[PDB]
Design a protein around this ligand. Structure first.
Ligand SMILES: *[C@@H]1O[C@H](CO)[C@@H](O)[C@H](O)[C@H]1NC(C)=O
Ligand SMILES: *[C@@H]1O[C@H](CO)[C@@H](O)[C@H](O)[C@H]1NC(C)=O
Ligand SMILES: *[C@@H]1O[C@H](CO)[C@@H](O)[C@H](O)[C@H]1NC(C)=O
Lengths: 597, 194
């Protein structure tokens, strides 16, 4: 009759074919990432090409279905999701140029070398030749030159690349009814279709600003605090009032801050919790590490992991003979194929990433019910947070005690809490300023509201006004620093690692509210209950069938990024940071010059 | 007055696609379903008639035995009244049906790596089918009202699709072989004994 029945029929056919096409393509991709050879490398080509071709051909057809007569919401969202040609809105030549330039980015990140200026022979690369230099080697000039040379090389080798890439992606997003590729990314939160649940595509910036000035006090506190000890280390370069120098930071870029753990640890006498030697002297292997994570998810009431998972996964580096990728990832191929890819050295951290990846899975396993276009997390943000509240609820002393993985006499004193909360803060409140600054810079660089001739100037200006980090030397616009970050010149929506942060703590409190919990948020577990699992499941098994605001409201009762609960989680550290800051200058100025003599 | 090919129905190695489900009428059996009942290896023994006991004790007139192949999560669809993706386009039992539905996951046998494409199932059709009536047809399905004259194109689709099995699947997407025993008693002197 009307376009409704024709749409429904087309969706039936598209599902029943796309499932198998995707399965075969992704299983080829899997077999590559487990058994890298030339054979499986080639075999990745044909199936991926087949999938991309099916998508092109079957999307071009679903445009005669003009969305004016779609009354039912499910089909409306489905067609709205399928009617995107990705980058196809370009002519074939521009699309070729775009994939070419993207691959230049990917490879020029995979390569890239710098040779020490006094050691013209020890010439290393970003990955594990430069990471360990700028993680623990405390000598100032060493890391200074390391960071400097990396930025300089990748700048001279990437500035024109990103320079033209911005214009190309901008024209692409322009051809698909979007102001800029920044609007393209933002359109990932554009969820709508109910009473008030309509979340616009521009409201995102408003919620970001609203949610970031509320967290600013904690981060200024912790920044001044860390600056105290980092000035105690080098009382010759750190400024008593200005922001701390860039290169002398935790990781390569400053995005994470857990690498600067010892130089500014709290009182260095308390035993930081870890159970490496504990199960190491009990003789646990990878499979026993995962047995416990599965037991944790089956306790809370989430579904029991499946038998195909245990025989097809890659729990541990096999005997030898094969060249693996060695990076933990959760593959869900489809059709009920759930697999985990990771090299498992018995360790505390490889005991929490277990929980994280199995959370990724336990999510992908719940929404294996929707019609295959509603098979992504409620948005691009819920996913890396569902597999994260399970991690943070596994680092409590109470959990480790329950399984008896540490001495069953631990006292859980104040100092333990403070050291642990600072440990977690140096990543969770350290990633937020840089993430937000970088994403607010990309958003301002797509919209052309800043000159192409002026990209690094305002870049470092925002860096030092919203993150609190000054550049070691004043680079000119012959460089393009932030492209150096992996997530920049590899086309990933990076605001994802912002939102989930807020999200997870929100989620945390939600379960802790229903899990009948009393104490401080940070000292909480979720196991040995059912409602604390089912109240998550009710949103877990929806995909993006429903506009993410409703899915969110099913568990939190709120409707937006609502960061009260984060500051509640870091409340003890908030107080103790205040107390350690009774005689410091919370805040910074911008006058430190690299060299004004 | 002898045992009859129940085994030859079950232990065959060529089970036919769901839509083209073959049927092997059996007659004049000294039939012992209990050497079936005590298998304890089937994935689905849901009976809709009399207990295995009274089956073994009573002699019926004539029996019919269906056999086909479907994914895992569709062994519940073969049942007296159940809608679904196939369920009424490939094999739709009636309302008072009085036979049993045997089903077993033989993943290893029926599903070879790379894809055992030789199994077909009929997707969207014009109308809901009836008891026991197979549909072998392959006439193109006309979505709207535009004529396409027997070539799949814009809003013109092929009914028979195929779910390519594999061994690396879920417990619900694997080839669950199924066999349906439909009995009936009429005015004729009952033949299949036990
Ligand atoms: C690994 O790859 C080789 C050749 O690429 C192949 O012969 C072998 O069967 C593969 N191993 C597995 C476990 O798939
Ligand atoms: C959960 O309950 C089991 C038995 O009821 C007990 O052995 C275990 O210690 C409990 N763990 C937690 C974290 O409550
Ligand atoms: C197995 O199949 C063969 C050939 O179809 C048949 O002769 C045999 O009787 C079957 N097995 C049993 C136990 O009947």
């Amino acid at each position: 009759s009307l376009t409704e029945e024709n749409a429904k029929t087309f969706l039936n056919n598209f599902n029943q074919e796309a499932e198998d096409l995707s399965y075969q393509s992704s299983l080829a991709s899997w077999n590559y990432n487990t058994n890298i050879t030339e054979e499986n490398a080639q075999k990745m080509s044909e199936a991926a090409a087949k999938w991309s071709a099916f998508y092109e051909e079957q999307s071009k057809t679903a445009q005669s279905f003009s969305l004016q007569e779609i009354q039912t919401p499910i089909i409306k969202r489905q067609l709205q999701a399928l009617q995107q040609s990705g980058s196809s809105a370009l002519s074939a030549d521009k699309n070729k140029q775009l994939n070419t330039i993207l691959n230049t980015m990917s490879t020029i990140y995979s390569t890239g070398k710098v040779c020490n200026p006094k050691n013209p022979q020890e010439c290393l690369l970003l990955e594990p030749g430069l990471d360990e230099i700028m993680a623990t080697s405390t000598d100032y000039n060493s890391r200074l030159w390391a960071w400097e040379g990396w930025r300089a090389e990748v700048g001279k080798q990437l500035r024109p690349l990103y320079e033209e890439y911005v214009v190309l992606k901008n024209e692409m997003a322009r051809a698909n009814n979007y102001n800029d590729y920044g609007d393209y990314w933002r359109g990932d939160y554009e969820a709508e279709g109910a009473d008030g649940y309509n979340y616009n595509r521009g409201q995102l910036i408003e919620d970001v600003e609203h949610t970031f000035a509320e967290i600013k006090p904690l981060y200024e506190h912790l920044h001044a605090y860390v600056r105290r000890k980092l000035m105690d280390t080098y009382p010759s370069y750190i400024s008593p009032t200005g922001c701390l120098p860039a290169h002398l930071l935790g990781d390569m870029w400053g995005r994470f801050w857990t690498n600067l753990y010892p130089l500014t640890v709290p009182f260095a006498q308390k035993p930081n919790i870890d159970v490496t030697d504990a199960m190491m002297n009990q003789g646990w292997d990878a499979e026993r590490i995962f047995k416990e994570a599965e037991k944790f998810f089956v306790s809370v009431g989430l579904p029991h992991m499946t038998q195909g998972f245990w025989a097809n996964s890659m729990l541990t580096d096999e005997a030898d003979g094969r060249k693996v990728v060695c990076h933990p990832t959760a593959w869900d191929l489809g059709h009920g194929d759930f697999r985990i890819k990771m090299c498992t050295k018995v360790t505390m951290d490889n005991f929490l990433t277990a929980h994280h990846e199995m959370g990724h899975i336990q999510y992908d396993m719940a929404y294996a019910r929707q019609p295959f276009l509603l098979r992504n997390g409620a948005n691009e943000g819920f996913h890396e947070a569902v597999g994260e509240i399970m991690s943070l609820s596994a680092a409590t002393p109470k959990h480790l005690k329950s399984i008896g993985l540490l001495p069953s006499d631990f006292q859980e004193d104040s100092e333990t809490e403070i050291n642990f909360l600072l440990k977690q803060a140096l990543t969770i409140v350290g990633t937020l300023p840089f993430t937000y600054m970088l994403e607010k810079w990309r958003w301002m660089v797509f919209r052309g509201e800043i000159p192409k001739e002026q990209w690094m100037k305002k870049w470092w200006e925002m860096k030092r006004e919203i993150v609190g980090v000054v550049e070691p030397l004043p680079h000119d616009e012959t460089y393009c620093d932030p492209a150096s970050l992996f997530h920049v010149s590899n086309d990933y929506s990076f605001i994802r690692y912002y939102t989930r942060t807020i999200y997870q703590f929100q989620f945390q409190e939600a379960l802790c509210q229903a899990a009948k919990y009393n104490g401080s948020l940070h000292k909480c577990d979720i196991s040995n209950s059912t409602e604390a699992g089912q109240k998550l499941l009710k949103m877990l098994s929806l995909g993006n069938s429903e506009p993410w605001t409703k899915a969110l409201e099913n568990v939190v009762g709120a409707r937006n990024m609502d960061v009260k609960p984060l500051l509640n989680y870091f409340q003890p550290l908030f107080d103790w940071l205040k107390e350690q800051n009774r005689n410091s200058f919370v805040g910074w100025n911008t006058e430190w010059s690299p060299y004004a003599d | 007055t002898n045992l009859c090919p129940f085994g030859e129905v079950f232990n065959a190695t060529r089970f036919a696609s769901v839509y083209a489900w073959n049927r092997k009428r059996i007659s004049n059996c000294v039939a012992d379903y209990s050497v079936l009942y005590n298998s304890a290896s089937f994935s689905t023994f849901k009976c809709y008639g009399v207990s295995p006991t009274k089956l073994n004790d009573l002699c019926f007139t004539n029996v019919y035995a269906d056999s086909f192949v479907i994914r895992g999560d569709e062994v519940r669809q073969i049942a007296p009244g159940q809608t679904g993706n196939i369920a009424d386009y490939n094999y739709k039992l009636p309302d008072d049906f009085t036979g049993c539905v045997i089903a077993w996951n033989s993943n290893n046998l029926d599903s070879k790596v790379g894809g055992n494409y030789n199994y077909l199932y009929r997707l969207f059709r014009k109308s809901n089918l009836k008891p026991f009536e197979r549909d072998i047809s392959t006439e193109i399905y006309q979505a709207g009202s535009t004529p396409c004259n027997g070539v799949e194109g814009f809003n013109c689709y092929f009914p028979l699709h195929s779910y390519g099995f594999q061994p690396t699947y879920g417990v619900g997407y694997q080839p669950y072989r199924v066999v349906v025993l439909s009995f009936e008693l009429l005015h004729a002197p009952a033949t299949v004994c036990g």
